[PDB]
Amino acid sequence: TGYLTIGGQRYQAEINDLENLGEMQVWKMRFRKTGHVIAVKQMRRSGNKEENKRILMDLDVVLKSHDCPYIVQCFGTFITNTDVFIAMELMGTCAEKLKKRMQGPIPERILGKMTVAIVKALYYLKEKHGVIHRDVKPSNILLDERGQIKLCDFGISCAAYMAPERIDYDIRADVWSLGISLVELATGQFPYKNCKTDFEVLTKVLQEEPPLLPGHMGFSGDFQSFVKDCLTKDHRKRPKYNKLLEHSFIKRYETLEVDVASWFKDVMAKTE
Numbered sequence: 001t002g003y004l005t006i007g008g009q010r011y012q013a014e015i016n017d018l019e020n021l022g023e024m025q026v027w028k029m030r031f032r033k034t035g036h037v038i039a040v041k042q043m044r045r046s047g048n049k050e051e052n053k054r055i056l057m058d059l060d061v062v063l064k065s066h067d068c069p070y071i072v073q074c075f076g077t078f079i080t081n082t083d084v085f086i087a088m089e090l091m092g093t094c095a096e097k098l099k100k101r102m103q104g105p106i107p108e109r110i111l112g113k114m115t116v117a118i119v120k121a122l123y124y125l126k127e128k129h130g131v132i133h134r135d136v137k138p139s140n141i142l143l144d145e146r147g148q149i150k151l152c153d154f155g156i157s158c159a160a161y162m163a164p165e166r167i168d169y170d171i172r173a174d175v176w177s178l179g180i181s182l183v184e185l186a187t188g189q190f191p192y193k194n195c196k197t198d199f200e201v202l203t204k205v206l207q208e209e210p211p212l213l214p215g216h217m218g219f220s221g222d223f224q225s226f227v228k229d230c231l232t233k234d235h236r237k238r239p240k241y242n243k244l245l246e247h248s249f250i251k252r253y254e255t256l257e258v259d260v261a262s263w264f265k266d267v268m269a270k271t272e
Contacts (some may be wrong), residue, residue, distance in 0.1 A: 065129070113260050115256065135161070222252060
C-alpha cells in the first residue's frame, strides 16, 4: 500500500525518486523513473490535527474511488517517520481560475461536459460510499490539458453556494450549489456578487427569486431548464442526482463530441 506509484503501470518508488518542482502543502513533482509529473500532498505528523484529519478523510474517499473516472485519483503513498506523501494525478486548474483566465462567460458546451462529469461524480459518491460532498463550487471542479473534468478533494465529504433548506439535510443542497456554480461560470458573474457579508448572501438566497440563466445569451432550453431545476427553492421538490441524470441536458452531453482539450489549451495560452 505504501512505496509504489501506479499510473497505468506499477513502479516501486520512494520519496527520493521524486523531484520537487515547487508548490501549487501540495507540490508538483516529477517521478524521475518515468518523467510523469504528479501532484503530491505532504502531510506532516507535526501538522494541525484538524488539517491532517481532513487530508486523511479526503484520502480515504479518494482511495475508495478508483472505479470513478470523474474523481481525481491517488497514484500512491510514501510514509516516513515524520511525513506522509500522497501522490495524486496533477490537473491543470479549477473552474474558478478558468473563469478569471477567460475574463468572461464559459461556453455552454464546456459547461455541459462539466455538468455530466460533476453530477456523475457526486452521484457515485452518494450511491457507493454514502458521501454527500457538501461543498460544490467552481474551485472544486478540475480540468486538464487532456479534456478531463473531475471533482477535487472532499476533506469534509462555502456560504454562498448554500441551499435554502441548509440555511433554514440531503444531497439536494449540493444540487443547489451546482446550480449557482453553473450560473456563475455561464454568465461570468457570481449571482450574489453585490453582497458584503455571508449572512447577506443567505438573505438573498431566501428572499429573492432563484438566479436563473439569462434569456438573451443563446443558452439552450435544455441548459436553462437544467439550471431552473437545480435552483428550485423548495428542497422538497428539488431533483436528486437520480432524476438529474435523465435530464435532456445531461443526455445531450453524454453523447455530444466537444473538444474540451483544445478549448482548454487555448484558454490557458491566453495566459496573457
